[PDB]
Amino acid sequence: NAGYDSADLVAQLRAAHSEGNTTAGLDMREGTIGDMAILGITESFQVKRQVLLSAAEAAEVILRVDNIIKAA
Amino acid sequence: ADEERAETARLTSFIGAIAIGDLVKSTLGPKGMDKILLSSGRDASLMVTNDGATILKNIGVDNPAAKVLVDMSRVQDDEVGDGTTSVTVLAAELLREAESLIAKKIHPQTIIAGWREATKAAREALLSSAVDHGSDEVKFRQDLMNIAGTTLSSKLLTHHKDHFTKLAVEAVLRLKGSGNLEAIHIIKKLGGSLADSYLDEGFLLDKKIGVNQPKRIENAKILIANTGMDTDKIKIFGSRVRVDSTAKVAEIEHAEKEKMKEKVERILKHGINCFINRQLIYNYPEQLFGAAGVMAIEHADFAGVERLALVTGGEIASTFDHPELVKLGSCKLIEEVMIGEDKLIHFSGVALGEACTIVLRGATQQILDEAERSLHDALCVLAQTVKDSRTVYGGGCSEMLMAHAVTQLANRTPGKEAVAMESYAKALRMLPTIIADNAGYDSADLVAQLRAAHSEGNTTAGLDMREGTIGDMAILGITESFQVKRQVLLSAAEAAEVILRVDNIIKA
């Protein structure tokens, strides 16, 4: 979305949280790593706990439906 | 006239590896199945091949990227042993992973570095698990018994494995400081038992005593020479010409019997009945040598004097011009022993040191050929135990020890190279996948479970796929040398990165 090397920026950010650098993630306006815990980019707690809930849910439900029957 | 673009040349590099990596991955590990070579290009034959060199060389690869893989796996098998099998799979396992990087469009130079530093990461984790078991003499005795059980395995043997085990372990411990790779000799002959392999007290030459010659020579004084004959002996300054028609063809074939008598006059002046020569004789010269009183001992070699040089204290020499240039031989008893189906003369005497002679018994040539390389693999590796008594857990238990630590170093250390360092470690865990189906176990439940398990505690626990279960790699004796596992990594890592740097194949 920022239009960058995703393989670089993830593996850079994977190197961050590996030792536990959690207070800094990628500020996407330059795609560079920057501050967190308020930046403008530090997001809402209530959003992701709902997004993690539903996305893991329905994708397994898609795995449940193998016996699809079309009668229309 | 053909310049092939990178997009096919990279793809040729991968399909060159996959089409050969699947050939031997049946035969890798404890090998729940084999590879059956089928002969139709040369003759009508059938070959059961667990030897990768029989798989690689007899099936000539026509993928030029696969030609690099066969060559670098060849030299690894020559020096260390079991090198065509292990190197080729691990290179092929890496190149399946590298396609996903090119599917993600990763820089190929990242893939070059990514496997390289992870190879450095693996060998240190391989070094941390390297532990001495050849420390004390009772330990060094039981060290080599379990390793020879592992190295002689992954091949086809009927009852041979345990007797080639306990024979070679006796050969290594007697020297105490080097392995026996200098003057031990692998003699293969037709035998009646598929279990026998015994060490010689002395050494043997191929001599079936025939016409009138005595069976035992006593108080030996050996005249060692290189001058000999097969059927031909012309005069020194003269000759005989018998051709002017078609009836002279029969008479020129009858003159070869009278050529055999002139060489006997040379040995008769010596008065030495112990004359060895490099050239062979037939039924036709043998009636002439023993009648003079001087016995011709044929099929000699440098190996017999060299075996006589180390134990007795002599030297190996050649170029018989004057008898003081070749070091002569001395023995106590010359007796003819009958080994297997074959009668050979045997210079018996002092033995048991830097030099031996290993005789093999089997009526099948295919059983004798596989037993040679299987014994050829271990004697270098048992000499590598003399170099480094550090053993490591065979059967892929050491494989997960490296995949445990490289994966951790794939996370922390790089910033872009993590996708290339992980393709190393994922290909490391492909090695228990190709053996879990061979024992029938689920490969997905194997490769992640035990890797975390023995690394967090009890590293001895490893892959006992002679049961399809998890077993202990120092209690069940499934362990090999640190040196053999160290060398097969670098040959597998390099050859994949060599053809990965290939981004222009051009066929003139």
Binding site: D8 | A6, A9, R501, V502, D503, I506, A508
Partner: protein
Amino acid sequence: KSRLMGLEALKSHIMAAKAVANTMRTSLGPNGLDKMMVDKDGDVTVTNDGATILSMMDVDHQIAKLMVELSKSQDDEIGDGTTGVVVLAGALLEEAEQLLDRGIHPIRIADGYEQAARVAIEHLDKISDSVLVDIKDTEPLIQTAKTTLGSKVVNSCHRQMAEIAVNAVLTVADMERRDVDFELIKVEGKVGGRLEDTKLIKGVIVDKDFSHPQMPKKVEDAKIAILTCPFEPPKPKTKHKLDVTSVEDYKALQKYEKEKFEEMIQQIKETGANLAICQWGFDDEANHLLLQNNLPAVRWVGGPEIELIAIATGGRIVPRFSELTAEKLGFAGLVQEISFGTTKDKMLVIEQCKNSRAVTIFIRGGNKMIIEEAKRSLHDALCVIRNLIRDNRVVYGGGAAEISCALAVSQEADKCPTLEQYAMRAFADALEVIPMALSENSGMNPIQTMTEVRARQVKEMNPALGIDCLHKGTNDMKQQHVIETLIGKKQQISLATQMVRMILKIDDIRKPGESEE
């Protein structure tokens, strides 16, 4: 008859040039990805050099058939840089289509490409000062040949190779008005011992013959008997008839030839030059007889091997046994014997302090495959030093001077504002393709790579601070020590604009069915 007019010409000029420039740009620098070759005999060959591959690839187009002789001029003069002239000139070429697609005439840009080449060469006079004294400048060449060796043929830089290679050139340059000839030097490689083994020979080497160790293995005074005449019985590969009257006649014949062996001694030794070398060979029978008779002799010598020792000594060769003088003998500075390899045999090294007409670096290998790959690194290292010994003009290339002249030529499109400005623009953007290509074959992003040193040109002009290709994160050219000759980079300017000039030379693109057929 098919005629491919104008653009239709240039589309044929695109596709071969597009192919050859793309295979070079994956091969720039030590991060250059290697070039694989299957021969016409079906033989696997892996290099990273273009002048090898362009000679080896069967060229099938007017663009492609050009590149053999174009890369011939670069490698014979400069050495390294076979890839960069192809990447650059194709990048002007593909941009010239875009100008021709813009409607800009292909002639007015080919006029301006030469003037764009002038202002770049003008800029190199300002770039990278040209004074490097003789004792000091060996060490950056020790660093430069470290770069060629330490990443391509051997991962960890044979130190004995890069330091001998700068010493062979001063042996010839001093006698040759501060210049070296490439036939007065030779990169000589013989495997058999260790790959760490590397020697400098001021003359040539021959394998020294001794038949028995019981017979004395001699080496003596610095004068060589360069002979074709028999000091030992020779062998021109044929057969007489043998006949003696009696056996005791042969018993006296051994006593007769022993006096004849001493006569061949007392003729040569009274003239000097006690190391006797004869061209045609012999067995080891009378060889160790002459070794017992206290003069060493070398047998089975190659044909031209007597010539190369003659010019290295500077003296002549003795043609006949009856014509005997010292001017037809060798004039050597040192004749000493050193073992060939480590395990097989010995050589006879004939060094001269008189004539540097054949100064041969002598390397060994433990592998036959590595040594021509080692020699190819040594072939180009001995060509770049020829540029320095004449004039000490150097360049900090690899990403610094590429972005620097790309500033200048684009500025010269504005300073000299006329019609050639798009030709200078096609020259300037094509200069940026090169340090892109050093990062393109690298694991780094080349799009990030052109950004950084461009800001450094805002910071500092005439850079000794360009990109790295060792991924050390230290982008320099003087502390990254990536430095080349200014003559070599300037030659690459002339060669790249030569090719675009060459494909513009007639307006004929018609064929009778046979102009490439």
